[PDB]
Amino acid sequence: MVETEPVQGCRDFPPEAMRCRRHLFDVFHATAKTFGFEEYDAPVLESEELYIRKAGEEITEQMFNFITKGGHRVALRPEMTPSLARLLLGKGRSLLLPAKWYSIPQCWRYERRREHYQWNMDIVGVKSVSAEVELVCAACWAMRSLGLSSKDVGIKVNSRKVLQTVVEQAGTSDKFAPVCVIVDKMEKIPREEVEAQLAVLGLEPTVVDAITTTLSLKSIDEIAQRVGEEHEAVKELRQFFEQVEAYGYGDWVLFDASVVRGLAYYTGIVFEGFDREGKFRALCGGGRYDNLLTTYGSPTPIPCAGFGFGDCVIVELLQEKRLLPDIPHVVDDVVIPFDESMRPHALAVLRRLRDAGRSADIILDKKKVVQAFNYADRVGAVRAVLVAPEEWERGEVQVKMLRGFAVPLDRLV
Amino acid sequence: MVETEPVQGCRDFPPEAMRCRRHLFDVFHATAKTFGFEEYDAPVLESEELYIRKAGEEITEQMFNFITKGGHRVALRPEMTPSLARLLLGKGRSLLLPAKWYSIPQCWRYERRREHYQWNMDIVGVKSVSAEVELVCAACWAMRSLGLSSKDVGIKVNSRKVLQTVVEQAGTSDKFAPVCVIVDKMEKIPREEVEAQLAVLGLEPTVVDAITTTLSLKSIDEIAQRVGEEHEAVKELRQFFEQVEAYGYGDWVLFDASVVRGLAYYTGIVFEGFDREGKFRALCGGGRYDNLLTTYGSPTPIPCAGFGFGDCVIVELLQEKRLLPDIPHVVDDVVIPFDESMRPHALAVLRRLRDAGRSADIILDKKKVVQAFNYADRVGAVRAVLVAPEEWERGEVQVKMLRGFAVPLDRLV
Numbered sequence: 001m002v003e004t005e006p007v008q009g010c011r012d013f014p015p016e017a018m019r020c021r022r023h024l025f026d027v028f029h030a031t032a033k034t035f036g037f038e039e040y041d042a043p044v045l046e047s048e049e050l051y052i053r054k055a056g057e058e059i060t061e062q063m064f065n066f067i068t069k070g071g072h073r074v075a076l077r078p079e080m081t082p083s084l085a086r087l088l089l090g091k092g093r094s095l096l097l098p099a100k101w102y103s104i105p106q107c108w109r110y111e112r113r114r115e116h117y118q119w120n121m122d123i124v125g126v127k128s129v130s131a132e133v134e135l136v137c138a139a140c141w142a143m144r145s146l147g148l149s150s151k152d153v154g155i156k157v158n159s160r161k162v163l164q165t166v167v168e169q170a171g172t173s174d175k176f177a178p179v180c181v182i183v184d185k186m187e188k189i190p191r192e193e194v195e196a197q198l199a200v201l202g203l204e205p206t207v208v209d210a211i212t213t214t215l216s217l218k219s220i221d222e223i224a225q226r227v228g229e230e231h232e233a234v235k236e237l238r239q240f241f242e243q244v245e246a247y248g249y250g251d252w253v254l255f256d257a258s259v260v261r262g263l264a265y266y267t268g269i270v271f272e273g274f275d276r277e278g279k280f281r282a283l284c285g286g287g288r289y290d291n292l293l294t295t296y297g298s299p300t301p302i303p304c305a306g307f308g309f310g311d312c313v314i315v316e317l318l319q320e321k322r323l324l325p326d327i328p329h330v331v332d333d334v335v336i337p338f339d340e341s342m343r344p345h346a347l348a349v350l351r352r353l354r355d356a357g358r359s360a361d362i363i364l365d366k367k368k369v370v371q372a373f374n375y376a377d378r379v380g381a382v383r384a385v386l387v388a389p390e391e392w393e394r395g396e397v398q399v400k401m402l403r404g405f406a407v408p409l410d411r412l413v
Numbered sequence: 414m415v416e417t418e419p420v421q422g423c424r425d426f427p428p429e430a431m432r433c434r435r436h437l438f439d440v441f442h443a444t445a446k447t448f449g450f451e452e453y454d455a456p457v458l459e460s461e462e463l464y465i466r467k468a469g470e471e472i473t474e475q476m477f478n479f480i481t482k483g484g485h486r487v488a489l490r491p492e493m494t495p496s497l498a499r500l501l502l503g504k505g506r507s508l509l510l511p512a513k514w515y516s517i518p519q520c521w522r523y524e525r526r527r528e529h530y531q532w533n534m535d536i537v538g539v540k541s542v543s544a545e546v547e548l549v550c551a552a553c554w555a556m557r558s559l560g561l562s563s564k565d566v567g568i569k570v571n572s573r574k575v576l577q578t579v580v581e582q583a584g585t586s587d588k589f590a591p592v593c594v595i596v597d598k599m600e601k602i603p604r605e606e607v608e609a610q611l612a613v614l615g616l617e618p619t620v621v622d623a624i625t626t627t628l629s630l631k632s633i634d635e636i637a638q639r640v641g642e643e644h645e646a647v648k649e650l651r652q653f654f655e656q657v658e659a660y661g662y663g664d665w666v667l668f669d670a671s672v673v674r675g676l677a678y679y680t681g682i683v684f685e686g687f688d689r690e691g692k693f694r695a696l697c698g699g700g701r702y703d704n705l706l707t708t709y710g711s712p713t714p715i716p717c718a719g720f721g722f723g724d725c726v727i728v729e730l731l732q733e734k735r736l737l738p739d740i741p742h743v744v745d746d747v748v749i750p751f752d753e754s755m756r757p758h759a760l761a762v763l764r765r766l767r768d769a770g771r772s773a774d775i776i777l778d779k780k781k782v783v784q785a786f787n788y789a790d791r792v793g794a795v796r797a798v799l800v801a802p803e804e805w806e807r808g809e810v811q812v813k814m815l816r817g818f819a820v821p822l823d824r825l826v
């Protein structure tokens with residue numbers, strides 16, 4: 001016998017599971033269309049150097065990578081943003097801006113799940129916080145579309161520019177991205193573990209204190225005290241909250257100075273979806289990354305912002321809230337030939353039903369009417385169309401609503 | 414600068430290209446729904462042993478495979494059918510039959526394109542030729558849905574049981590699959606090249622002659638002469654053509670004794686889509702594979718049939734026929750704030766438009782009304798909604814159909 005289980009850390013999607021996945025993706029697609037985003041895709045296989053950012057990120061540490069027979073360093077993508085940037089950089093100035101691009105790539109890791117799907121939404125060429133507003137609104141929209149409300153979830157919001165200043169004032173920008181990465185672990189691991197990693201980086205106790213203090217500031221007015229009420233970060237966050245309020249999602253968003261995210265390239269606003277019961281990891285996460293494309297070699301800086309919204313946590317949350325009823329398969333009609341002699345006519349009928357835009361099966365193998373009705377019920381047919389000899393000569397079939405009257409063929413549809 | 418081109422043999426899908434892909438996939442999805450097929454998926458990464466069939470197949474020869482760090486032999490799938498079978502075998506008798514499963518997996522190869530998408534349709538648990546009929550009808554349906562007609566394309570049809578007999582009568586079944594694989598190359602390479610490979614296998618000139626002769630038989634009546642009018646293969650092919658005729662696609666299908674296909678596991682009917690101008694490779698291909706699941710270790714034999722329908726040839730054909738007009742992006746509304754002071758109201762309006770199921774952008778960065786209208790035109794907006802101070806106090810906005818009247822907010826939608 002052959003191994004029936006999938007490769008380590010990977011999921012099979014038989015029909016029942018695939019319907020659940022579809023329910024989720026329909027929402028991501030529908031939301032992207034509602035917000036004017038355009039679909040794109042790129043190869044799951046990318047060059048390894050595309051991710052070599054040298055900042056101690058988990059996403060680069062846990063790369064599912066290998067070498068081709070031709071000796072090329074490749075990887076199954078751990079995230080999409082680098083593919084996006086590559087695509088953007090290749091377009092250059094033929095690319096018209098602003099651009100709003102989205103996708104639902106499978107992404108991979110190696111260390112426990114080794115793949116996940118991640119809805120990516122990104123706005124490109126928009127300097128202002130209106131991009132982040134739109135992005136954050138898209139994510140709430142998606143969650144509400146799935147049945148969640150502001151009671152169930154929210155979106156925490158911060159700016160890395162705050163911490164940028166404190167790192168600048170205590171020194172060298174080259175170390176900022178590495179620090180954000182370490183400081184991201186603060187919620188997870190003890191302060192002792194994070195302090196030591198920051199000290200290992202070569203930062204002194206003075207700057208570490210200031211970092212700690214600023215992560216634990218509770219309101220935007222407190223950030224104004226420490227940084228100034230016209231630090232670009234303050235005006236931006238106020239603009240952001242004002243705009244989200246005006247769109248009607250003020251109950252969904254809030255400030256949190258502890259939110260930095262684990263990715264090196266964020267420069268401005270960052271955000272995280274969360275459940276309001278404290279039970280699950282981040283539902284999504286994102287932010288502004290204005291320098292990435294400059295780092296990839298762009299002559300002109302390209303402002304960007306976006307998020308990723310995984311397919312795991314959201315599903316667990318929806319299951320907990322009882323918002324993932326299994327929805328069984330459906331089909332409009334099941335055509336039932338009275339017997340094999342009636343098959344040709346049954347096919348003709350099947351053609352008519354399908355030509356009208358209906359979803360229709362025909363009983364394929366040899367079986368009794370009563371077996372076929374049960375079969376019809378099992379596949380979730382709305383209607384069973386029995387094709388029998390007597391009715392056929394009257395130009396009719398027998399129709400029976402499952403959720404048996406004689407009907408003229410033209411009336412079936 | 415970073416490498417902007419994708420990894421060797423792989424395609425990028427920027428928005429313009431992705432729309433073309435979507436047009437094609439919408440059809441595969443829509444067709445699968447019309448025919449009552451159910452979506453499934455499995456990991457692109459599968460165990461290498463899953464494909465070790467030892468019959469000299471191109472699909473196994475050209476495997477994009479590698480070794481994990483844990484020392485496991487894996488591969489990026491060259492086809493889906495083995496994943497399907499694995500999924501089916503794991504379900505066992507909890508699986509209800511017949512089952513009609515479909516997917517659109519990316520599949521890979523290493524040798525020139527190294528990936529392609531392939532619509533897979535498969536019927537499971539159906540002994541009779543009604544499965545093949547349905548499958549063949551689905552493929553024609555798809556092609557017509559894309560704008561092709563019976564003038565443009567057809568589906569060639571044959572049975573391997575014919576050749577099965579001739580191999581049996583001249584000898585040992587273990588060699589049958591290898592022979593089908595060699596005989597598949599007949600159309601491509603010289604008869605001398607195919608003869609030598611069959612002779613290399615250990616088959617004598619007598620059986621080779623008989624093979625050649627039977628591949629070049631032109632009608633079903635000629636196969637009846639050589640094999641008998643009640644060879645199961647004759648009755649099946651007549652049943653098949655009778656049923657396809659009755660469904661209304663008789664002009665789309667025909668017999669061809671040279672069609673064997675390149676895959677080892679086919680046992681009964683096999684078929685190939687083709688363009689009637691002789692310009693392109695196979696558009697799709699499929700057949701019955703009644704022993705595969707027995708070979709994977711099933712206690713009870715499971716009848717199966719299916720096809721794969723690639724995304725390359727079909728597109729070239731549609732391009733040649735001028736049936737792939739580029740269809741530009743569309744969005745219902747573009748909300749234009751008169752200026753930044755109007756942004757909050759513009760957002761509120763944006764919310765209303767989207768709540769009504771409309772697709773809507775808002776101008777995100779700072780720009781002049783006339784720039785924003787041009788922007789609206791460039792994104793293919795059906796309508797531009799200008800939000801200006803004077804109209805706002807009258808409870809109105811300015812609306813202008815792009816494919817400027819004042820309108821009350823409640824009337825916008």
Ligand SMILES: N[C@@H](Cc1c[nH]c[nH+]1)C(=O)O
Nearest residue numbers: 079081286287306307308
């Ligand atoms: N790539 C990020 C999400 C993102 C998309 N765009 C910007 N950020 C992640 O995996 O967390």
Ligand SMILES: N[C@@H](Cc1c[nH]c[nH+]1)C(=O)O
Nearest residue numbers: 492494699700719720721
């Ligand atoms: N796997 C086959 C197509 C197929 C699906 N089901 C049966 N056959 C191919 O790649 O050609």
Ligand SMILES: Nc1ccc(Cl)cc1N
Nearest residue numbers: 107108109113114115116
């Ligand atoms: N980056 C990433 C890739 C794959 C999985 Cl399953 C999880 C993460 N976090």
Ligand SMILES: Nc1ccc(Cl)cc1N
Nearest residue numbers: 520521522526527528529
């Ligand atoms: N099996 C296969 C896989 C990938 C490509 Cl691009 C082509 C083929 N034929």
